[PDB]
C-alpha cells in the first residue's frame, strides 16, 4: 500500500517569531507512525536552515521552488545542488502559483523536476486544470498534458509524489466534491499505468491540493486513488496536526 | 561628494562551506574607511541569515531579489517584509538576468523598487541595454524608459543606488571602454537632473555592473559619474577586495 503523505505548504508567510511557534506546535504534535504517513513541511528559502535545525528528525522539510538547472548567473534563484548542500531533501515544483503568476510553462516545470531528482531530490509536481478547462470537458486533457511534460523528462518516479490542484476549487468559494476527485486521481493513475508502467501507477502517491472545508479531510484521504494532502494556509495553523491525523484508517 | 560604492552579487553560487571561507576572507580585510566606501554583499536567500550571522558589521547584506507586495498565496517567493524581518537591509532589483531570464518587465521592476522602499529596504535597482538596442543607437533610449518606470513610482530616491548593466559586456567576450560608461552614466545622471531633480541627481550613486579586466576597476572608478561598481564573479574571490579599495 502506498504510504499516506501530508505536505505543507507555507506560502510567501512567515517571521522568525512566527516559524518558531509552529515548529515547536509540530514539534509537541503526537501523531500517527511513520509506517502510516509521511509529514513534509515548506516554509519560504530564508527560513529554511532555521526549520531544518529546529523541526522533530521524523518531519520533513521542503523548498517551494528551485532552478531548473545548474547554479551560475541566475541572480534570485536558488539551485537543487545548494538545498541538497543544506540538506533539504524536498522540493515543491509547478505549483499552480508559479505556473499562473510567474508564467511557468509545462515544459520548464518538467526540466525543473527532471535536474532536482538528478541532484537526489524527493518532488511534490503539481498539476491541475483552470475553470475554463473543467467546464470544457479539459480536466483529463490538461492533467495528462502537464503529467506527460514531466514523465517525458524524468528517468525515474521513485521520489515523485504528484499534487492534483483543481484551480478553480483553491481559495475560490467553490470546492471538489470527493467524487469529483477521485474521478481525476482514478484517470491520472491510469494514465501512469499506461504510458509509464503499473509498477509506476501502483507506487507513486497521488495527493489532493484543493479547498476542504474544516472535518472533510478523512472523507477525501479514504477515496481509493487519493494518498494525502498539499496544504495550503492551514499549515501555518494547528489545524495541520489534525489533517496528519486524517492518515489514521 | 557622493560615497563610493561596492556591491557583490553572488548570484546562484554558494555552499555553507564556501559562505563560510568568503566570509572569514571579507572579516580579514583591511580596506579603506566607512567615509570613503560603502561595502554590500548579496548572497542566495538560503545563505542570508547565515551571511548576516557572521560577516563583519561594517560591510551590508542584501538579498538578490524580493517580492513585488506584500506576502501571502505566492509560492517560492520571499517578501521585502521578511528581509526586513532578518534584518537584512539592502536589495538587488531588476538585475539583468532576471529582466532576461525571468521576464522581469520595466514595470515590475517598478512596482518592486517602490515596494521594497516603502517596506524601509534599501535598492540597488538595475538598468540596462541589450546587444541589439546597443547597436541600433537606442541605449539611453532604453536605459531613461528603465530609469523612467522606476522614477514614476518612487518619490524618495535617497535610499537608492543604481546600477548600469551593459548587458552585452557582461559574460560575453566583450569589454566596454571606460568612456562609454561615463558616457551611459552621464546621460543617466543628467536625465535624473531633468525628470526628479537636480539635488537627486547630484547625490544619487550611479554604479557599474559591466565586466572589467583584473587590474582596470581604478580607471573605471575615477570617472566623473561612475561611483562604484556592483560585481559579479570576482565576489566570491579574494579580487573583491582588491575591488573595494579602488575606493582610494
Ligand atoms: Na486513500
Ligand atoms: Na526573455
Ligand atoms: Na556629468
Ligand atoms: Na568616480
Same mark, same amino acid.
Given at each position: ?59 520533513? /522539510? @521542503? ?6 538547472? +545548474?547554479?551560475? %548567473?541566475?541572480? *534570485? #534563484?536558488?539551485?537543487? =545542488? ?30 525543473? /523536476? @527532471? ?6 531530490? +524527493?518532488?511534490? %509536481?503539481?498539476? *491541475? #486544470?483552470?475553470?475554463? =478547462? ?39 468559494? +467553490? ?75
Amino acid at each position: 500500500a502506498r504510504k499516506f503523505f501530508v505536505g505543507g505548504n507555507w506560502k510567501c508567510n512567515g517571521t522568525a517569531e512566527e516559524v518558531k511557534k509552529i515548529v515547536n506546535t509540530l514539534n509537541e504534535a503526537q501523531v500517527p507512525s511513520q509506517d502510516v504517513v509521511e509529514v513534509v513541511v515548506s516554509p519560504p528559502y530564508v527560513f529554511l536552515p532555521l526549520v531544518k535545525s529546529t523541526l522533530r528528525s521524523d518531519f520533513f /522539510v @521542503a523548498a517551494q521552488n528551485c532552478w531548473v538547472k +545548474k547554479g551560475g %548567473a541566475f541572480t *534570485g #534563484e536558488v539551485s537543487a =545542488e545548494m538545498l541538497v548542500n543544506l540538506d533539504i531533501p524536498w522540493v515543491i515544483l509547478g505549483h499552480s502559483e508559479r505556473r499562473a503568476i510567474l508564467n511557468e510553462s509545462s515544459e520548464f516545470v518538467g526540466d525543473k /523536476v @527532471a535536474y532536482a531528482l538528478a541532484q537526489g531530490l +524527493k518532488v511534490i %509536481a503539481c498539476v *491541475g #486544470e483552470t475553470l475554463e =478547462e473543467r467546464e470544457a470537458g479539459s480536466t483529463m486533457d490538461v492533467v495528462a498534458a502537464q503529467t506527460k511534460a514531466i514523465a517525458d523528462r524524468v528517468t525515474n518516479w521513485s521520489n515523485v509524489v504528484i499534487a492534483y490542484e483543481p484551480v478553480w476549487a483553491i481559495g475560490t468559494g +467553490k470546492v471538489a466534491s470527493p467524487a469529483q476527485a477521485q474521478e481525476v486521481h482514478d484517470e491520472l493513475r491510469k494514465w501512469l499505468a499506461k504510458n509509464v508502467s503499473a509498477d509506476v501507477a501502483a507506487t507513486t502517491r497521488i495527493i489532493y491540493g484543493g479547498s476542504v472545508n474544516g472535518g472533510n479531510y478523512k472523507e477525501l484521504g479514504g477515496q481509493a486513488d487519493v494518498d494525502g494532502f498539499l496544504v495550503g494556509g492551514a499549515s501555518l495553523k494547528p489545524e495541520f496536526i489534525d489533517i496528519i491525523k486524517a492518515a489514521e484508517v
